[PDB]
Amino acid sequence: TLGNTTSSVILTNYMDTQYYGEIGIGTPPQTFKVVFDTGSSNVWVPSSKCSRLYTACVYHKLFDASDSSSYKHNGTELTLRYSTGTVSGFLSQDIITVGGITVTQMFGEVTEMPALPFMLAEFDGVVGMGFIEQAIGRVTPIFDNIISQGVLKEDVFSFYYNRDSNSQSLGGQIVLGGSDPQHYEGNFHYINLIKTGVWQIQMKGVSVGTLLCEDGCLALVDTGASYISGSTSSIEKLMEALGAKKRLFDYVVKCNEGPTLPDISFHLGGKEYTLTSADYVFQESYSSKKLCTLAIHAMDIPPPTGPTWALGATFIRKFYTEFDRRNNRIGFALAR
Numbered sequence: 001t002l003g004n005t006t007s008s009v010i011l012t013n014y015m016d017t018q019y020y021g022e023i024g025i026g027t028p029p030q031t032f033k034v035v036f037d038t039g040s041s042n043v044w045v046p047s048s049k050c051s052r053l054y055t056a057c058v059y060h061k062l063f064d065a066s067d068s069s070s071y072k073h074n075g076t077e078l079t080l081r082y083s084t085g086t087v088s089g090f091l092s093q094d095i096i097t098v099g100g101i102t103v104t105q106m107f108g109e110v111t112e113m114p115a116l117p118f119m120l121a122e123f124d125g126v127v128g129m130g131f132i133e134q135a136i137g138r139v140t141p142i143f144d145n146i147i148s149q150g151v152l153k154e155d156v157f158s159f160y161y162n163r164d165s166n167s168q169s170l171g172g173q174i175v176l177g178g179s180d181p182q183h184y185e186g187n188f189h190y191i192n193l194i195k196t197g198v199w200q201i202q203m204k205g206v207s208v209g210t211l212l213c214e215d216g217c218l219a220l221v222d223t224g225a226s227y228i229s230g231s232t233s234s235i236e237k238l239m240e241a242l243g244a245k246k247r248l249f250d251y252v253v254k255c256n257e258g259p260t261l262p263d264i265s266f267h268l269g270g271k272e273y274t275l276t277s278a279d280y281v282f283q284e285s286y287s288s289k290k291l292c293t294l295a296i297h298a299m300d301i302p303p304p305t306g307p308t309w310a311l312g313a314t315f316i317r318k319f320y321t322e323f324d325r326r327n328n329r330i331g332f333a334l335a336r
């Protein structure tokens with residue numbers, strides 16, 4: 001059932017790598033900064049029950065069930081394993097407000113929150129925008145619960161991620177139930193999902209200056225990933241072609257060579273989605289003696305989802321993305 005509501009969540013852009021918005025949990029609302037992540041399907045925030053020996057819990061907002069009159073205990077343990085780290089804790093139910101939509105939502109109260117990486121998170125928690133099929137503990141995801149209310153105009157949500165800057169700039173925007181034509185131009189071009197249950201599409205090629213994915217591969221369209229990622233062997237080849245040098249967590253080029261690195265193009269559906277070096281180089285200098293990191297990383301995502309590329313914020317900054325649950329497709333349009 002479809003209504004006439006669309007709702008928007010204003011996002012903050014932290015250093016082009018973490019895009020997060022606000023949710024309120026409980027009565028009265030406890031506010032949390034959260035990443036909205038199409039790569040996962042669970043909601044979690046740090047818990048007041050998190051031992052303060054987890055320094056990440058000292059440095060983030062903690063949900064306190066004992067201050068919420070709308071809290072409903074559950075207590076089933078859950079562990080959520082992401083590509084960059086793991087959190088563990090237990091299930092709780094409470095009222096969650098997101099863009100002025102209020103939903104009764106089961107979520108994780110995280111009691112184990114590793115300092116690496118979570119001391120480096122500006123956000124507190126995560127709101128998974130993936131399908132119930134990938135939800136740990138079969139917890140109904142938030143967007144599914146919003147859809148059940150029958151208020152949303154369309155069974156879709158859309159992501160705009162801005163370039164960083166100053167504070168008057170909008171970091172980004174999620175539209176629940178539609179899209180915002182203020183943040184894209186031209187027409188959407190749609191690629192059907194490989195299957196329902198994951199925001200993943202076929203990719204027909206990756207070109208540097210068709211070097212890779214020549215017989216097709218997978219692209220997870222991942223709003224919770226900072227970067228474009230490929231498999232180690234893909235990225236090793238991609239980076240050799242860019243003249244980039246591998247470091248522990250990233251690849252770098254000499255900053256003076258950054259501006260003249262070749263275009264990288266991603267063949268999705270009918271269209272080529274092209275990034276110039278300005279879209280994937282963190283140009284912090286123009287010096288031959290400084291190293292500039294690339295917004296393309298190696299990430300071996302395990303099966304059944306991987307091996308797969310992930311199109312994260314690096315991609316979404318250039319291409320406004322609509323996630324269409326009704327038609328099991330993803331639409332891209334040129335962001336403005």
Ligand SMILES: *[C@@H]1O[C@H](CO)[C@@H](O[C@@H]2O[C@H](CO)[C@@H](O)[C@H](O)[C@H]2NC(C)=O)[C@H](O)[C@H]1NC(C)=O
Nearest residue numbers: 072073074075076091092093106137138139140
């Ligand atoms: C935590 O939530 C789960 C899921 O809703 C509850 O499990 C259900 O329990 C009822 C009986 O109370 C069963 O009839 C359902 O079949 C269970 N569902 C699933 C998916 O397992 C569980 O009871 C809750 N636990 C607590 C302590 O509140």
Ligand SMILES: c1ccc(-c2nc(NCc3ccco3)c3ccccc3n2)cc1
Nearest residue numbers: 018019035082117120121223224225226
């Ligand atoms: C330091 C500390 C924490 C992270 C990090 N970042 C995540 N997403 C970043 C993001 C948001 C929007 C686009 O990209 C993330 C998502 C899901 C689970 C864990 C995560 N941990 C990264 C660096």
